[PDB]
Hints:
The structure is a homodimer.
Chain A: E1 4-10, H1 16-25, E2 29-32, H2 39-47, E3 55-59, H3 72-79, E4 86-91, H4 94-104, H5 116-131, E5 136-139, H6 145-155
Parallel strand pairs in A: 1-3, 1-4, 2-3, 4-5
Helix pairs in contact in A: 1-6
Amino acid sequence: GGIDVVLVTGLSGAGRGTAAKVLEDLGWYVADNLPPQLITRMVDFGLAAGSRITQLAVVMDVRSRGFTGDLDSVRNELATRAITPRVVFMEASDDTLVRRYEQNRRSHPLQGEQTLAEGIAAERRMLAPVRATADLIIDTSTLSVGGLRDSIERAFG
Amino acid sequence: GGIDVVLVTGLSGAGRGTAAKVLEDLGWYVADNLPPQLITRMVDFGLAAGSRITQLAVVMDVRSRGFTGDLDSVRNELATRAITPRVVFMEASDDTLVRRYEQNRRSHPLQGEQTLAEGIAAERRMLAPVRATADLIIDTSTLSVGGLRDSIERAFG
Ligand SMILES: CC(=O)N[C@H]1[C@@H](OP(=O)(O)OP(=O)(O)OC[C@H]2O[C@@H](n3ccc(=O)[nH]c3=O)[C@H](O)[C@@H]2O)O[C@H](CO)[C@@H](O)[C@@H]1O
Ligand SMILES: CC(=O)N[C@H]1[C@@H](OP(=O)(O)OP(=O)(O)OC[C@H]2O[C@@H](n3ccc(=O)[nH]c3=O)[C@H](O)[C@@H]2O)O[C@H](CO)[C@@H](O)[C@@H]1O
């Protein structure tokens, strides 16, 4: 209960990692791609003296082992410790996501048996219910990195 | 062991996160900024069926809670599970690191109220011992992102 927990999630390529880095610039301890089942371990570590963390941000998304799209089990276990996480959900238009993948030349996490476009759509379907529980949805369709820096500063300042 | 473990460390700005993304693109499960004490929890998680992970990469650096510069405890604990981690150490020339900090407009993790160059020199001093224990040292002074993909692919593909 003595640690602010932020969960950063959302569409791949919408800026999860960039948003994580902004939080780091603001003084948050950021852990990326922690499996849901291990968040209680991380929170207990943060509460122990000597290794104390007062502001913890975890990036959890389609890559995270055992993440299915619902944070209910995560929210349940965190509540037994008097913690209510703030969930930030990154998204962007299909057109912006496609452009970012063409520019980086990375594979989409759900691409392989389907196209890049089909992977984006499958991720949108997977995450629509958790999106509706996010405390903050940030749409990066036309945001620069500096614009994301300002949006996050405004919400975590 | 039952899981291959790679620890990615090195100088801030030398490409730790970019190297981690290449491993992710090659099929590795990548967790960034895990406290050293939680390495055993992640390995145990990856060894259980239902949450199996055969190739695990962890980024651990000056940001990681409890990381002092040595990987002695980590190597000791991993040994209790018959795992020998491979350590990858990212570095670059001072000039390249400074240019990357100017271009990305972020602060160095060890800068404090000191200058950028003071932060870089402090980190080089902290990490020189663990650098000597690295299985692979990657110098990114003149590497593009494409060059680093090729380098990592040759060492891990
Ligand atoms: C397109 C892409 O790289 N997707 C990957 C990226 O997603 P992730 O969602 O983490 O995307 P990043 O934070 O890397 O941002 C991707 C790109 O968008 C830019 N950007 C971001 C936010 C913003 O407001 N404005 C802006 O211009 C960034 O500068 C970068 O060029 O890393 C994940 C973790 O390895 C991978 O699973 C994703 O497949
Ligand atoms: C300069 C910078 O941003 N440093 C931060 C970066 O370090 P980290 O060491 O993770 O650096 P990144 O992987 O973000 O790479 C830094 C920059 O160098 C480029 N690059 C990288 C490797 C390569 O071979 N060639 C190349 O040109 C990347 O495209 C990027 O522009 O993220 C860490 C985690 O938040 C922070 O602690 C560091 O302060």
